[PDB]
Amino acid sequence: EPYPAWTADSQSPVSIEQIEDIFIDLTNRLGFQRDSMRNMFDHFMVLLDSRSSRMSPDQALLSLHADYIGGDTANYKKWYFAAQLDMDDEIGFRNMSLGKLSRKARTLNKIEGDNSLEAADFRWKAKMNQLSPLERVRHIALYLLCWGEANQVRFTAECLCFIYKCALDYLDSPLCQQRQEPMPEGDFLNRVITPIYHFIRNQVYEIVDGRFVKRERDHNKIVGYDDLNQLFWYPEGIAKIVLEDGTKLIELPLEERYLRLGDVVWDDVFFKTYKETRTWLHLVTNFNRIWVMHISIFWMYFAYNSPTFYTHNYQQLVDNQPLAAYKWASCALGGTVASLIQIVATLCEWSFVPRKWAGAQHLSRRFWFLCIIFGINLGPIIFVFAYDKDTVYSTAAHVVAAVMFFVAVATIIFFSIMPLGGLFTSYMKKSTRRYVASQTFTAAFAPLHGLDRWMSYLVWVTVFAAKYSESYYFLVLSLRDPIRILSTTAMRCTGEYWWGAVLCKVQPKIVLGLVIATDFILFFLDTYLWYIIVNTIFSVGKSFYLGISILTPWRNIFTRLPKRIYSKILATTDMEIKYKPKVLISQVWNAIIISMYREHLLAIDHVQKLLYHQVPSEIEGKRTLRAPTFFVSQDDNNFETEFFPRDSEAERISFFAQSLSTPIPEPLPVDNMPTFTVLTPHYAERILLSLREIIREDDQFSRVTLLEYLKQLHPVEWECFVKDTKILAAAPEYTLRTRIWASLRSQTLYRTISGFMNYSRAIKLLYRVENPEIVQMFGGNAEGLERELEKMARRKFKFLVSMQRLAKFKPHELENAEFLLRAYPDLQIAYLDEEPPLTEGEEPRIYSALIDGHCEILDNGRRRPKFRVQLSGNPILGDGKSDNQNHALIFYRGEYIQLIDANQDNYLEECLKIRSVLAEFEELNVEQVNPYAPGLRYEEQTTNHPVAIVGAREKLHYGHPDFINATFMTTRGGVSKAQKGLHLNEDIYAGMNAMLRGGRIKHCEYYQCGKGGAGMGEQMLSREYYYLGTQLPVDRFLTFYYAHPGFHLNNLFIQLSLQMFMLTLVNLSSLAHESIMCIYDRNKPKTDVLVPIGCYNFQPAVDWVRRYTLSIFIVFWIAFVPIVVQELIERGLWKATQRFIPFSILYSRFAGSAIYMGARSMLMLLFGTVAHWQAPLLWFWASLSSLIFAPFVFNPHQFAWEDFFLDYRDYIRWLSRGNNQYHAHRTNLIMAEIIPCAIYAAGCFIAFTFINAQTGVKTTDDDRVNSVLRIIICTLAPIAVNLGVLFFCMGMSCCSGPLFGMCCKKTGSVMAGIAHGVAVIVHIAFFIVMWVLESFNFVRMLIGVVTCIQCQRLIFHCMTALMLTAWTQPSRELTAKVIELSEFAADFVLGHVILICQLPLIIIPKIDKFHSIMLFWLKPSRQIRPPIYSLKQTRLRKRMVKKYCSLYFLVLAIFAGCIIGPAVASAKIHKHIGDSLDGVVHNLFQPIN
């Protein structure tokens, strides 16, 4: 009998014949497809069989009905309440105030409470209780039949619920029960499903010239897979269903809408329900709690510790004191800024969502309430700070100031704790929606019970307390001193004579905002650092207090393995005692050891040593089975050192033994364990290899060849294989054996199948060991004991493999698949199939078939499919894997599914704990109660939030799935989301959608699965992030944010910090160099004089530079140590130090992406170093150098003279080639690249202007500089001079006369070379011109060239932006050519500078190449892969490399002369230059005296 748990017992309420008749009757009445009815019947029977094993047959049907249709876990009940009784707001109110109602927990009367949902719940429970088993079977069968035929609307669960409700209503009508004509076969599929699929396909594709091609449109106008659900969520969207006549569907009676449903046009119904076109609006709206806290507290601190801002008439020695009202008003202004942040967030949210779909009447009220809060927070402070008190006042300023300060603190706390979506929902209560999103689906979070709630509270309170205290202390003091010093003093300079000397006066005030901004960024970094530290210490403390100490030697664990293994893996307490506890353990351990040795993973001396040593195995069984030297240890722990090593991945097994130490739930008898299935996709992967791959060498001369890899680098593996394979012997049998063995060591599907087919072996072993009756019942009949065990193995385990294509696979991969089916008969394969059309030219019909290793061979050599279900069309509209799993999901069995990849592997060691793993779903050892009892209420229910995902952990509140609840997840839509443009991850989206609807995610600890930035950052902005962010409570929101997006924001903040610091350093060093400074000490009272008269006291700014360097260094260290710790293994770092051309592509990629900023950073750092020396700049030097030169030390094959010269030749040729090659997102990138360049150039220009103000010297008027036009000349004239030569060449080529090129045989190459050469020459010439334009100073030249570079970059970006947004084409050509030649000059200079920097290194290793050997050693520490040289003719190569080396030295000499000549020219020239020049351009050269 196929299902013994239901038909053997006579206590079943119904028999198989009634169920079969019900299925047949439903198929006849509703016109279902005949081939799917049998599949669904088998599915339902397997469901009942699996569920009834641990329960009575009467309870299984009730539990299934509760889980599928009428229970409180079901989705149909949620949809019915939310979309037909209109009680979403009541559910929302119940969810938020569950503590108050639960605190009291430890038929004309129903009309009075009709509006309340408690009466509705009571009525529903009574109606469900009144049923009988036949109607329960009828409901479940109808739902399953409806589900198993819809193919792609299975992704939308609420459409399926609506269809099911309409079908049931029609079926119960007394009109279907009087008809005599059965409906034609396949009517449901076509008439109901096909138009929705047509809508979905036509939304994305388009038919042209007989095929289908994709459309060119933005995502903001397409509708797919979510707008359908959202329309079906609310009762106001169902009223939009329109018939073809213009009427509406809901006007018809309830028992007639199953035909006009097929007559519905879906074009005028669905619409877009969530528009996403931005990046910072989403960020601002989603996380408006972090910024409220941070900005508000920073403003409070900074406004309290800056008394000089509101001080009137400050004096350096008098130090007049203000009143306290001003400080209090400042803090209340901080409260006001928090309120303003909230208003901005709600405006962005209004921009977020569509116009008038269930979320329009809530945001205006919130806007008005926030406006009122802003007004009451702002008004009285405006009064106080507008100073009705300063003239005359009664003693009321202090009290009003204190009142407003406390009101501000209250506002900060309130707006920083409460969620945005649920602020003022307890005040409307009257007519319209009080929420923006559906509270039944989008916001249903499982409450946290027990000690975890308090642990999370404590962790977050500790983090925030420590952060606030430390940041206050440090930043407040270290900025309290510079703030006063820098805001007190002002300079005395001459300046420039087109607008005066205002910039020189206000420079020290300019140097303050940069410091403040840098401190802001440091605030953010500090909070992240404190989070990491506190979480780590809490985790280590919890691990310490758990009660398991790591100081015990593992030999005590090894000798305690017997009792624990017997208790946890083998013995179930409910069996009667028949054997001593010392035999079953021996059996299982010998089985696992011999299975380990079956793969030849160990030597011959250790296999017998590790065994239980049963030499007299066939006498009595007690005199033998004595413990070996491994299970029992000697008196000393580390006493065995002869054969106790078990190296070569035989120990690390020992992981299993270690994992046995953690607590493990009690097991269950094999007869009671539920059935499950294993699912895996396969598209174009590889199966067992052929002879060509296993007999052919690689392209290189024995370098990184897999064949030689497995032949040589198997020191014991290959020897063990050969010593046992050469005793077994065209040779077809030896041919196949080599194919099998070679496949098991490489990446193949056969390896995965062999690894995962251990479940049946483990189950058979457990079944034989556990039950001792059958073995003695047979008593010698091997056939019976193998047949019964095989039947038991087949009952409780299924394997499914999804092959997308098999009709067009391969002439030989088909034979491979046939061999696969022959090797393992139980394996099942699902594939797509096509049947030729029987009508005029139309789209081919598509099917779906399943075959196994038990169908006979057909006429054409194929196999007879068991089930063939017709699909509505081509299923693959996405990425494959998602749709590949979707089209084969209907062939699964059991209660649980395990999702695996195509390259995983499993060991028999980890397949003995499947029952323990499956027990983590908290449904195995649970007593059952009637779910429709009239007594209990919703609050007093323990089954409300089922666990959906259980993934073995090798988290972040959202883990990747390993095991999945089939019943929970398939009823809510798919096992993996399907969308090419929105849902790219099958692991995170599924977890967040499971959490949103009310499921629980767990993580195992004794199970290990077999496994080895911005691009997703901009795509992560979605609707799921919005729903999670605007609705979660504070602790859950914090723990979610600081894991997934907190990391990506922390990575971004550091770069902005570095750029701000570089600008600040440039301005500060200019200020300090230009002006004299003052003597300073440590304990000087503030009231005495400064010993040089007229000095400026500026040391605290330099001390600030020191402090910032220290802070950024420690932040980087704490953020970068874990990667090194993870990466460096080296046998545990020697037990943790005994317990305490290649140039071309890398240059392109890395040089661009990093050096294009590193070069400017290094230039600015060099100027700051050479203008005013400081100590921590030495540490700042060693970072950019490494970040630029890292690829050139990670790359071998760059350490030989001949190799270097060949690389140089390739460098020149590829330089030409790469210059040629490099020669809805446009405007946004244009803006985001234009603005920061303008700000950066403005800062550089201000610094450059100040350094020329010649402060500190006393002169008359008309004695200033005029650099404001020298900068413009030096940045603009090179553009014109580069345009001139290109214009000459282009004009000659456009003339294109009979003579074009007087001396050159070819014109294009020579003219391109001439233009490039003159461009680079004139650029270096104008750099020297800028040097000589001043009085031969170095630092002024440096700042001038930096400013010129920044200005040129800005104008290039602006010109490209203006050009991108019939002379239009030639103008674009000219502009592109100009940009190309500028970038060519820059890249030429950068590459040659890198080459000069590399020059001193090559002479060092010489022929000895000791450095090369060191590089080889370090590479071998990572990965060793070397080849052998080949000797051929070398005369031409030698000549070529000699000539190119001469060219390289010539270029070096030219560079050295160009950089050296100005030095001696300065050393010999006289002081006066351009004294005769006069007028508005007066002293263009810098006046030196």
PDB file of N, CA, C and O in Angstrom, residues 1259-1297:
ATOM      1  N   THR A1259      53.693  98.574   4.175  1.00  0.00           N
ATOM      2  CA  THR A1259      53.940  99.310   2.947  1.00  0.00           C
ATOM      3  C   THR A1259      52.790 100.291   2.746  1.00  0.00           C
ATOM      4  O   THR A1259      51.888 100.402   3.582  1.00  0.00           O
ATOM      5  N   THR A1260      52.822 101.010   1.631  1.00  0.00           N
ATOM      6  CA  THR A1260      51.788 101.967   1.282  1.00  0.00           C
ATOM      7  C   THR A1260      50.782 101.317   0.333  1.00  0.00           C
ATOM      8  O   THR A1260      50.806 100.106   0.097  1.00  0.00           O
ATOM      9  N   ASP A1261      49.883 102.127  -0.216  1.00  0.00           N
ATOM     10  CA  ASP A1261      48.937 101.647  -1.207  1.00  0.00           C
ATOM     11  C   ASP A1261      49.640 101.432  -2.546  1.00  0.00           C
ATOM     12  O   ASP A1261      50.799 101.810  -2.739  1.00  0.00           O
ATOM     13  N   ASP A1262      48.914 100.816  -3.481  1.00  0.00           N
ATOM     14  CA  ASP A1262      49.442 100.496  -4.809  1.00  0.00           C
ATOM     15  C   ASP A1262      50.715  99.661  -4.705  1.00  0.00           C
ATOM     16  O   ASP A1262      51.689  99.873  -5.430  1.00  0.00           O
ATOM     17  N   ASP A1263      50.707  98.707  -3.782  1.00  0.00           N
ATOM     18  CA  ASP A1263      51.834  97.819  -3.538  1.00  0.00           C
ATOM     19  C   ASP A1263      51.348  96.394  -3.354  1.00  0.00           C
ATOM     20  O   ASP A1263      51.814  95.663  -2.476  1.00  0.00           O
ATOM     21  N   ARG A1264      50.395  95.981  -4.173  1.00  0.00           N
ATOM     22  CA  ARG A1264      49.782  94.673  -4.046  1.00  0.00           C
ATOM     23  C   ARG A1264      50.015  93.851  -5.308  1.00  0.00           C
ATOM     24  O   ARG A1264      50.572  94.322  -6.302  1.00  0.00           O
ATOM     25  N   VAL A1265      49.562  92.606  -5.260  1.00  0.00           N
ATOM     26  CA  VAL A1265      49.716  91.688  -6.360  1.00  0.00           C
ATOM     27  C   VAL A1265      48.421  91.648  -7.160  1.00  0.00           C
ATOM     28  O   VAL A1265      47.387  92.163  -6.744  1.00  0.00           O
ATOM     29  N   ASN A1266      48.486  91.039  -8.338  1.00  0.00           N
ATOM     30  CA  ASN A1266      47.367  90.954  -9.267  1.00  0.00           C
ATOM     31  C   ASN A1266      47.262  89.525  -9.805  1.00  0.00           C
ATOM     32  O   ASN A1266      47.118  89.290 -11.005  1.00  0.00           O
ATOM     33  N   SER A1267      47.350  88.542  -8.906  1.00  0.00           N
ATOM     34  CA  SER A1267      47.384  87.138  -9.306  1.00  0.00           C
ATOM     35  C   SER A1267      46.045  86.621  -9.823  1.00  0.00           C
ATOM     36  O   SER A1267      46.014  85.561 -10.465  1.00  0.00           O
ATOM     37  N   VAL A1268      44.951  87.346  -9.578  1.00  0.00           N
ATOM     38  CA  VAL A1268      43.625  86.882  -9.969  1.00  0.00           C
ATOM     39  C   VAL A1268      43.492  86.723 -11.480  1.00  0.00           C
ATOM     40  O   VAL A1268      42.651  85.948 -11.946  1.00  0.00           O
ATOM     41  N   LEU A1269      44.305  87.427 -12.268  1.00  0.00           N
ATOM     42  CA  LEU A1269      44.320  87.188 -13.706  1.00  0.00           C
ATOM     43  C   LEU A1269      45.494  86.334 -14.163  1.00  0.00           C
ATOM     44  O   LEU A1269      45.417  85.738 -15.242  1.00  0.00           O
ATOM     45  N   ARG A1270      46.574  86.261 -13.384  1.00  0.00           N
ATOM     46  CA  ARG A1270      47.650  85.343 -13.734  1.00  0.00           C
ATOM     47  C   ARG A1270      47.170  83.899 -13.655  1.00  0.00           C
ATOM     48  O   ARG A1270      47.531  83.068 -14.500  1.00  0.00           O
ATOM     49  N   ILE A1271      46.317  83.590 -12.673  1.00  0.00           N
ATOM     50  CA  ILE A1271      45.748  82.246 -12.596  1.00  0.00           C
ATOM     51  C   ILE A1271      44.889  81.958 -13.824  1.00  0.00           C
ATOM     52  O   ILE A1271      44.965  80.871 -14.415  1.00  0.00           O
ATOM     53  N   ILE A1272      44.086  82.937 -14.251  1.00  0.00           N
ATOM     54  CA  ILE A1272      43.201  82.718 -15.389  1.00  0.00           C
ATOM     55  C   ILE A1272      44.012  82.573 -16.672  1.00  0.00           C
ATOM     56  O   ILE A1272      43.681  81.756 -17.538  1.00  0.00           O
ATOM     57  N   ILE A1273      45.106  83.327 -16.800  1.00  0.00           N
ATOM     58  CA  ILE A1273      45.962  83.196 -17.975  1.00  0.00           C
ATOM     59  C   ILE A1273      46.581  81.806 -18.018  1.00  0.00           C
ATOM     60  O   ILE A1273      46.521  81.110 -19.041  1.00  0.00           O
ATOM     61  N   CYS A1274      47.152  81.366 -16.894  1.00  0.00           N
ATOM     62  CA  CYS A1274      47.833  80.076 -16.876  1.00  0.00           C
ATOM     63  C   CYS A1274      46.866  78.914 -17.054  1.00  0.00           C
ATOM     64  O   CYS A1274      47.273  77.843 -17.515  1.00  0.00           O
ATOM     65  N   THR A1275      45.592  79.089 -16.697  1.00  0.00           N
ATOM     66  CA  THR A1275      44.647  77.995 -16.895  1.00  0.00           C
ATOM     67  C   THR A1275      43.938  78.048 -18.242  1.00  0.00           C
ATOM     68  O   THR A1275      43.407  77.025 -18.689  1.00  0.00           O
ATOM     69  N   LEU A1276      43.919  79.205 -18.909  1.00  0.00           N
ATOM     70  CA  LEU A1276      43.166  79.321 -20.152  1.00  0.00           C
ATOM     71  C   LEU A1276      44.047  79.253 -21.395  1.00  0.00           C
ATOM     72  O   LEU A1276      43.677  78.593 -22.371  1.00  0.00           O
ATOM     73  N   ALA A1277      45.203  79.921 -21.388  1.00  0.00           N
ATOM     74  CA  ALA A1277      46.051  79.937 -22.578  1.00  0.00           C
ATOM     75  C   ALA A1277      46.445  78.551 -23.084  1.00  0.00           C
ATOM     76  O   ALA A1277      46.494  78.371 -24.315  1.00  0.00           O
ATOM     77  N   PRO A1278      46.762  77.561 -22.239  1.00  0.00           N
ATOM     78  CA  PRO A1278      47.032  76.218 -22.777  1.00  0.00           C
ATOM     79  C   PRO A1278      45.887  75.645 -23.596  1.00  0.00           C
ATOM     80  O   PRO A1278      46.141  74.931 -24.574  1.00  0.00           O
ATOM     81  N   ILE A1279      44.637  75.941 -23.239  1.00  0.00           N
ATOM     82  CA  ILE A1279      43.507  75.461 -24.030  1.00  0.00           C
ATOM     83  C   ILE A1279      43.587  76.007 -25.449  1.00  0.00           C
ATOM     84  O   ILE A1279      43.461  75.263 -26.429  1.00  0.00           O
ATOM     85  N   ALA A1280      43.815  77.315 -25.579  1.00  0.00           N
ATOM     86  CA  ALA A1280      43.891  77.927 -26.901  1.00  0.00           C
ATOM     87  C   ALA A1280      45.088  77.412 -27.689  1.00  0.00           C
ATOM     88  O   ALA A1280      44.981  77.163 -28.896  1.00  0.00           O
ATOM     89  N   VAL A1281      46.241  77.252 -27.034  1.00  0.00           N
ATOM     90  CA  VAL A1281      47.419  76.817 -27.779  1.00  0.00           C
ATOM     91  C   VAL A1281      47.286  75.357 -28.203  1.00  0.00           C
ATOM     92  O   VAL A1281      47.809  74.962 -29.250  1.00  0.00           O
ATOM     93  N   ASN A1282      46.592  74.529 -27.413  1.00  0.00           N
ATOM     94  CA  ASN A1282      46.307  73.168 -27.857  1.00  0.00           C
ATOM     95  C   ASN A1282      45.277  73.156 -28.975  1.00  0.00           C
ATOM     96  O   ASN A1282      45.353  72.316 -29.879  1.00  0.00           O
ATOM     97  N   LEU A1283      44.306  74.070 -28.928  1.00  0.00           N
ATOM     98  CA  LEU A1283      43.323  74.163 -29.999  1.00  0.00           C
ATOM     99  C   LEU A1283      43.954  74.624 -31.304  1.00  0.00           C
ATOM    100  O   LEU A1283      43.476  74.253 -32.376  1.00  0.00           O
ATOM    101  N   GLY A1284      45.010  75.436 -31.235  1.00  0.00           N
ATOM    102  CA  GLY A1284      45.584  75.993 -32.454  1.00  0.00           C
ATOM    103  C   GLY A1284      46.176  74.943 -33.378  1.00  0.00           C
ATOM    104  O   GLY A1284      45.919  74.944 -34.585  1.00  0.00           O
ATOM    105  N   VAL A1285      46.972  74.027 -32.823  1.00  0.00           N
ATOM    106  CA  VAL A1285      47.617  73.008 -33.648  1.00  0.00           C
ATOM    107  C   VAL A1285      46.584  72.033 -34.197  1.00  0.00           C
ATOM    108  O   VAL A1285      46.640  71.627 -35.368  1.00  0.00           O
ATOM    109  N   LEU A1286      45.628  71.637 -33.355  1.00  0.00           N
ATOM    110  CA  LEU A1286      44.556  70.761 -33.811  1.00  0.00           C
ATOM    111  C   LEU A1286      43.727  71.435 -34.893  1.00  0.00           C
ATOM    112  O   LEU A1286      43.296  70.784 -35.848  1.00  0.00           O
ATOM    113  N   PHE A1287      43.497  72.744 -34.763  1.00  0.00           N
ATOM    114  CA  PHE A1287      42.778  73.493 -35.785  1.00  0.00           C
ATOM    115  C   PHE A1287      43.553  73.527 -37.092  1.00  0.00           C
ATOM    116  O   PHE A1287      42.966  73.385 -38.166  1.00  0.00           O
ATOM    117  N   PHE A1288      44.872  73.725 -37.023  1.00  0.00           N
ATOM    118  CA  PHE A1288      45.686  73.699 -38.234  1.00  0.00           C
ATOM    119  C   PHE A1288      45.583  72.347 -38.931  1.00  0.00           C
ATOM    120  O   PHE A1288      45.323  72.273 -40.140  1.00  0.00           O
ATOM    121  N   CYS A1289      45.769  71.263 -38.172  1.00  0.00           N
ATOM    122  CA  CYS A1289      45.713  69.928 -38.764  1.00  0.00           C
ATOM    123  C   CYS A1289      44.328  69.624 -39.324  1.00  0.00           C
ATOM    124  O   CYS A1289      44.200  69.082 -40.431  1.00  0.00           O
ATOM    125  N   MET A1290      43.276  69.974 -38.579  1.00  0.00           N
ATOM    126  CA  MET A1290      41.917  69.719 -39.040  1.00  0.00           C
ATOM    127  C   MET A1290      41.588  70.549 -40.271  1.00  0.00           C
ATOM    128  O   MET A1290      40.902  70.070 -41.178  1.00  0.00           O
ATOM    129  N   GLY A1291      42.067  71.792 -40.327  1.00  0.00           N
ATOM    130  CA  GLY A1291      41.843  72.606 -41.505  1.00  0.00           C
ATOM    131  C   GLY A1291      42.533  72.050 -42.734  1.00  0.00           C
ATOM    132  O   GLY A1291      41.956  72.027 -43.822  1.00  0.00           O
ATOM    133  N   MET A1292      43.777  71.586 -42.578  1.00  0.00           N
ATOM    134  CA  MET A1292      44.457  70.957 -43.708  1.00  0.00           C
ATOM    135  C   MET A1292      43.715  69.707 -44.171  1.00  0.00           C
ATOM    136  O   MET A1292      43.529  69.496 -45.377  1.00  0.00           O
ATOM    137  N   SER A1293      43.270  68.873 -43.226  1.00  0.00           N
ATOM    138  CA  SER A1293      42.573  67.647 -43.606  1.00  0.00           C
ATOM    139  C   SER A1293      41.211  67.933 -44.232  1.00  0.00           C
ATOM    140  O   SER A1293      40.772  67.189 -45.117  1.00  0.00           O
ATOM    141  N   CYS A1294      40.526  68.990 -43.790  1.00  0.00           N
ATOM    142  CA  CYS A1294      39.251  69.351 -44.400  1.00  0.00           C
ATOM    143  C   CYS A1294      39.445  69.977 -45.772  1.00  0.00           C
ATOM    144  O   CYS A1294      38.602  69.795 -46.658  1.00  0.00           O
ATOM    145  N   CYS A1295      40.534  70.726 -45.965  1.00  0.00           N
ATOM    146  CA  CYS A1295      40.871  71.193 -47.305  1.00  0.00           C
ATOM    147  C   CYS A1295      41.113  70.014 -48.235  1.00  0.00           C
ATOM    148  O   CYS A1295      40.574  69.973 -49.348  1.00  0.00           O
ATOM    149  N   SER A1296      41.907  69.039 -47.784  1.00  0.00           N
ATOM    150  CA  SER A1296      42.060  67.755 -48.471  1.00  0.00           C
ATOM    151  C   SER A1296      42.414  67.940 -49.944  1.00  0.00           C
ATOM    152  O   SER A1296      41.867  67.275 -50.827  1.00  0.00           O
ATOM    153  N   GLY A1297      43.337  68.858 -50.214  1.00  0.00           N
ATOM    154  CA  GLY A1297      43.750  69.137 -51.567  1.00  0.00           C
ATOM    155  C   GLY A1297      44.567  68.004 -52.151  1.00  0.00           C
ATOM    156  O   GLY A1297      44.836  66.997 -51.489  1.00  0.00           O
TER     157      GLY A1297
END
